[PDB]
Copies of this chain bind each other. A is one copy, B any other.
Amino acid sequence: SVQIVYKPVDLSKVTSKCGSLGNIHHKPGGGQVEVKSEKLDFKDRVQSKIGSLDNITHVPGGGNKKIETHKLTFR
């Protein structure tokens, strides 16, 4: 016979205190962008991105992250 007892216990804390968060400046692509193309041949797929793209400002007041995985596998 088999007994498996799976009773992990978590009383854990993940915490931040921040007295103030701010004055955050993100200025991507202030410079002039100039693209000049003549007599180009493309015989397959083209992906083109020009300018200021996909830029992120992410400012969470906590942003604390608990990641936990429990796996019990039996045969």
Contact = CB atoms under 8 A, between A and B. Distances in A.
A5 B9 CA distance: 13
A interface bracket (residues with beta carbon within 8 Å of B): 35 or more
A63 B62 contact: yes
Given A26-B55, A62-B18, A70-B71, A35 B38 contact: no
Contact of A18 (B16, B36, B39, B51): B16
Given A9-B8, A21-B20, A58-B59, A52 B49 contact: no
Contacts of A12: 10-14, 66
A32 to B, nearest CB: 5
Interface of A: 1-75
